[PDB]
Design a protein around this ligand. Sequence first.
Ligand SMILES: NC(=O)c1ccc[n+]([C@@H]2O[C@H](COP(=O)([O-])OP(=O)(O)OC[C@H]3O[C@@H](n4cnc5c(N)ncnc54)[C@H](O)[C@@H]3O)[C@@H](O)[C@H]2O)c1
Ligand SMILES: NC(=O)c1ccc[n+]([C@@H]2O[C@H](COP(=O)([O-])OP(=O)(O)OC[C@H]3O[C@@H](n4cnc5c(N)ncnc54)[C@H](O)[C@@H]3O)[C@@H](O)[C@H]2O)c1
Ligand SMILES: O=C(O)/C=C(\O)C(=O)O
Ligand SMILES: O=C(O)/C=C(\O)C(=O)O
Ligand SMILES: [Mg+2]
Ligand SMILES: [Mg+2]
Ligand SMILES: [Mg+2]
Ligand SMILES: [Mg+2]
Lengths: 339, 342
Amino acid sequence: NDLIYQDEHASLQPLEGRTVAVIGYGIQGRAFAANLRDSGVAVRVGNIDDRYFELARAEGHRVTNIAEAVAHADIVLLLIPDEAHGAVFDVDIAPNLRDGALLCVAHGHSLVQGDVRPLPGRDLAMLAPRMYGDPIRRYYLAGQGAPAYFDIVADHTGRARDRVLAIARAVGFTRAGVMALGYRQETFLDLFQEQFLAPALVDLVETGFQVLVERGFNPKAALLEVYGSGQMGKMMLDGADIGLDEVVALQGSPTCQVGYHRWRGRTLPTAVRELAARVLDQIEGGDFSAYLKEQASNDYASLDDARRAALKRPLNVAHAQVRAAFRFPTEAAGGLYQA
Amino acid sequence: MASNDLIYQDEHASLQPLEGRTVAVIGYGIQGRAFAANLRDSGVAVRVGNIDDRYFELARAEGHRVTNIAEAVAHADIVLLLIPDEAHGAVFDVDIAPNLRDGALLCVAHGHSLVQGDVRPLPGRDLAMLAPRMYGDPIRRYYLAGQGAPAYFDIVADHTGRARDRVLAIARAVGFTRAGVMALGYRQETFLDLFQEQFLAPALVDLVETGFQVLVERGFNPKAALLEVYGSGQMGKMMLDGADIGLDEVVALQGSPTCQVGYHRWRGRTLPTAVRELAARVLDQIEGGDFSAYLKEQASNDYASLDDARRAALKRPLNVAHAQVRAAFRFPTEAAGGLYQA
Ligand SMILES: NC(=O)c1ccc[n+]([C@@H]2O[C@H](COP(=O)([O-])OP(=O)(O)OC[C@H]3O[C@@H](n4cnc5c(N)ncnc54)[C@H](O)[C@@H]3O)[C@@H](O)[C@H]2O)c1
Ligand SMILES: NC(=O)c1ccc[n+]([C@@H]2O[C@H](COP(=O)([O-])OP(=O)(O)OC[C@H]3O[C@@H](n4cnc5c(N)ncnc54)[C@H](O)[C@@H]3O)[C@@H](O)[C@H]2O)c1
Ligand SMILES: O=C(O)/C=C(\O)C(=O)O
Ligand SMILES: O=C(O)/C=C(\O)C(=O)O
Ligand SMILES: [Mg+2]
Ligand SMILES: [Mg+2]
Ligand SMILES: [Mg+2]
Ligand SMILES: [Mg+2]
């Protein structure tokens, strides 16, 4: 049965007098470091020589190379790209991790692949948020949080669980709920969302756009309806609260509800479920992991080509025209991660 | 051609056309309540026309002048018909057409009743569409934050010669010009809107549900499966942030390199030709009147079949798991009480 920890099941007491080293200052690192500091936890940043080092300095952190950050830490959070874990673990972290220190990863992939391993005399855990950095930070400032999964991999001290959950409470995840989930299951589940569901959702939106344009509809209007208006995003985000079918029952005109229920459960051929299973097979059997290791070559050169090509697609050419023509509601983001 | 679009923002509209004029909001539902609240807060005289149901009493509780539909229309310079589309014909013929003042403007928020001839131009009066691209709660939240949602508009009949500026004055008062109000024919709006509702929304939910089903079959924790496919809010946040910056751009900005490599392995490759073929079949049903005939049947005995569909949907594994997850994990929400009070 599920172990789910909220604020009533965790406290900041395990962090009293302890220093947390945030290794990395990217999407997750910057949010962890800002929320730890604002929760009254002693925090320092370990980072390589790049723009993120200078950003952490600009945002008032104590910033050093990774080895020095680890040497001064009771708890180490490894918040860099998963393919970089092995080399940073072997050279910078393992030689410097204090006796009884806790190392946490935010994704199980390096644990599954054996690139991060238990060390005699130390604790090892996963604390894997189910959300990206900007919302984790916005939620934090509003007294809210995003869910996370956790796993205690090695517990020399016997205190790893309460220390991991104290980090979770300091960063805000216990405000939603932190659920026990094995690091191997987290790895495969996370990769499936990234490789099947996210591309399929965008491909579906793009298909709607392409069919409307082919059938003679105004391209700006087509782009707005399939996502650009924010209606489809709002339906999916409100759906997280109340349920997706319930959003239609509450917010749809009767015309909309009759239309939706004419095709609900009937839109997809078997090829979609079949492809989902094929993607999960690639994830569970190591095919994706071998692909990722290849792709990390030349600092992800192939991904650079894919990112640049995607911007040239009709959907993204139309996006730029629609976004220049219609003002989208935005909140100022400058200084979001300052104290 | 991109260059040919007519898009109106705040710089292209004003409230001057509404000076001394009363707007009758007919209906107080998802759209009606947002229009009435925003018109009032924009300093526009507004009254509500509504049948004898809970929405009449809600409009009273929220401080409006509320009467039957005929009386609201008889006292109005501008009439906004914000009731379900299948009810337009009977309300138009009995309650609106006999009471619409000489030179008055009637607006609909969807082209369907215009396509079907259930709402028609009247000698001496103006007729228009102002069709929001968002539901009521966000229209209201955006309004209070100095923001708005897009809308499409069409001037169908313009006896006065003033219909365009009066429609755009309503749009400015309700907030749509803060985003942009684009000229689009009522027939095109009808088919485009119905396509989003009948192909895209069900396909997105069907896809989320497919992800959930496959994970549960393959032995994944059902709460975790539900959270990842939408329950965490991550997929909704990605699609809503995507509206701002682009969907591929959200992944480039907010994805780990692991996530981006995974996404681009399958981007543009996940769907078989059968999906675009079904989209074309749905559009054929919409363009040729098949959906309109289905809607007229379904409206029978106050949408009894829709009641059966709504209740059956809640029993699907996805929605059983939703209730378990939502009880176990706190989702960030804003207090909504009094959102539509002055
Ligand atoms: N992006 C998310 O929302 C998210 C959510 C949950 C979990 N995760 C996990 O969090 C971890 C961090 O991911 P992210 O998305 O924040 O990454 P990111 O791409 O934002 O990481 C950038 C950071 O990594 C550092 N870095 C990059 N390459 C490095 C290398 N070779 N050696 C040392 N440092 C290097 C940079 O200096 C910078 O501090 C990963 O394990 C990822 O799977 C990410
Ligand atoms: N729901 C949306 O977000 C949305 C967005 C844009 C356009 N629209 C359009 O706005 C209009 C109103 O839709 P809605 O979603 O607000 O509807 P709704 O289901 O919320 O409408 C309920 C309202 O309609 C009234 N009503 C219901 N049946 C009636 C009848 N037979 N006679 C008279 N009044 C009746 C009720 O008293 C109440 O005031 C429609 O033309 C719809 O297509 C809806
Ligand atoms: O655009 C919307 O949000 C909703 C509709 O068009 C509807 O419910 O009919
Ligand atoms: O969960 C997320 O938001 C993002 C990831 O898992 C990722 O970028 O790897
Ligand atoms: Mg993830
Ligand atoms: Mg509609
Ligand atoms: Mg619509
Ligand atoms: Mg991930």
